Design a binder for this molecule. Structure first.
Ligand SMILES: Cc1noc(C)c1-c1ccc2c(Nc3ccccc3C(C)(C)C)c(C(=O)O)cnc2n1
Length: 127
């Protein structure tokens, strides 16, 4: 029972929406990040069991990953772009909180975050 359940990718009680900004986040931002050579460790939830990180979910209480973000986008889980941007930010910050500066995973995260920030800089106007 070591890993927690993953973050939800759908919810019957959460209102759903498609916006051009959310479309951009899936088509341009996530797509660009997903194919980056350092993306793979972020493409699914951290498996603290398999990775032998027994304290991971003791430290990180709001886990997030690009696999979850991808599904949320594909499922129209979000109401707005801010919610999705928040998930990306949580993913990166979690990584910086858990690992030490100069760990390879942190360098990988930093590469992805730089690219993330460049793509969301050109987030289009709503509608
Ligand atoms: C993401 C993330 N956030 O915190 C941690 C911790 C991770 C993380 C780190 C490594 C992962 C990983 N491979 C791995 C395992 C041990 C040492 C070094 C690495 C790499 C530098 C190659 C990433 C894998 C994997 O090998 O499948 C998956 N998720 C990981 N998450």
């Amino acid at each position: 029972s070591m890993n927690p359940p993953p973050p939800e990718t759908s919810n019957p009680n959460k209102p759903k929406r498609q916006t051009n900004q959310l479309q951009y986040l899936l088509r341009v931002v996530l797509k660009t990040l997903w194919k980056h050579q350092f993306a793979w460790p972020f493409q699914q939830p951290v498996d603290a069991v398999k990775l032998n990180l027994p304290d991971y979910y003791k430290i990180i209480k709001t886990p997030m990953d690009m696999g979850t973000i991808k599904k949320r986008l594909e499922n129209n889980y979000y109401w707005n772009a801010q919610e999705c941007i928040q998930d990306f930010n949580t993913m990166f910050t979690n990584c910086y909180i858990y690992n030490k500066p100069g760990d390879d995973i942190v360098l990988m995260a930093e590469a992805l975050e730089k690219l993330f920030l460049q793509k969301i800089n050109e987030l289009p106007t709503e509608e």
